[PDB]
Design a protein around this ligand. Structure first.
Ligand SMILES: *[C@@H]1O[C@H](CO)[C@@H](O)[C@H](O)[C@H]1NC(C)=O
Ligand SMILES: *[C@@H]1O[C@H](CO)[C@@H](O)[C@H](O)[C@H]1NC(C)=O
Ligand SMILES: *[C@@H]1O[C@H](CO)[C@@H](O)[C@H](O)[C@H]1NC(C)=O
Ligand SMILES: *[C@@H]1O[C@H](CO)[C@@H](O)[C@H](O)[C@H]1NC(C)=O
Ligand SMILES: *[C@@H]1O[C@H](CO)[C@@H](O)[C@H](O)[C@H]1NC(C)=O
Ligand SMILES: *[C@@H]1O[C@H](CO)[C@@H](O)[C@H](O)[C@H]1NC(C)=O
Ligand SMILES: [Mg+2]
Lengths: 115, 115
């Protein structure tokens, strides 16, 4: 149910020292990163994950420069940054997946009848 | 992770034509009731549920009058209202359970290189 400001593609040349792959959720609700999860995929593997429960990011060695700016996630910006080496060696189709996890709670009230 | 403005118990007398059992979530995030689920339990059974995704409420016949005001739910007010006849036969501990459903989405961007 999260909605995106979509972009078909972006382009870089040998002049780019670094690249940004845009990803913007337009209907974020999370007030804290604790229930946000972000996954970037490339050719069907996870090349970046942010686990908001842990406030930690995991990257594979072949995408060692991949990062998001966690300070922007609550605005719905999940944009992927990386160095040109990683960009050049991984041109093609990227998937940006964002999740806001379930939240629940309960409370107990006793209903009393007085006479 | 949902938090409540709690009340240990609420009293009613013969004068109450209807009864209100308070339930107030203090940290709601949902912007649409389609994402919210409410379950009121009494003695180990579900005596009222609202499935926000379906915009539908279910009650057992022994709580036929039981309801919430859906218009108040995004404020975190999941308070249960019933007739005195349904209340007087069912004194004791009520549990109010509120859930804000997970939300996910994905988008694809091609990173293209230009010579
Ligand atoms: C590469 O650099 C140009 C020059 O500013 C910029 O417009 C473009 O967005 C960059 N490409 C990417 C994919 O970051
Ligand atoms: C990326 O996806 C598009 C279709 O969405 C496809 O036409 C294109 O060939 C893909 N790019 C690569 C490098 O496979
Ligand atoms: C019963 O009525 C009184 C006064 O009208 C009110 O203060 C009280 O909250 C009511 N009790 C319930 C359980 O609704
Ligand atoms: C809430 O979300 C649903 C699903 O997108 C939509 O149909 C509905 O119009 C929205 N607004 C209200 C007031 O229910
Ligand atoms: C659920 O019912 C309410 C009636 O107050 C309506 O406003 C809302 O649009 C309905 N939810 C939908 C269509 O998702
Ligand atoms: C409701 O719960 C409390 C637990 O704090 C318990 O002391 C009490 O006996 C329960 N009331 C009824 C009517 O079973
Ligand atoms: Mg949520």
């Amino acid at each position: 149910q999260l909605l995106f400001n979509k972009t078909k593609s972006v382009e870089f040349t040998f002049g780019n020292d670094t690249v940004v792959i845009p990803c913007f959720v337009t209907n974020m609700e999370a007030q804290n990163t604790t229930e946000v999860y972000v996954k970037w995929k490339f050719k069907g593997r996870d090349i970046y994950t942010f686990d908001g429960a842990l406030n930690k990011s995991t990257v594979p060695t072949d995408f060692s420069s991949a990062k998001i700016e966690v300070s922007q996630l609550l605005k719905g910006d999940a944009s992927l940054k990386m160095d040109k080496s990683d960009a050049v060696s991984h041109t093609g189709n990227y998937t940006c997946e964002v999740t806001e996890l379930t939240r629940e709670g309960e409370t107990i009230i006793e209903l009393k009848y007085r006479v």
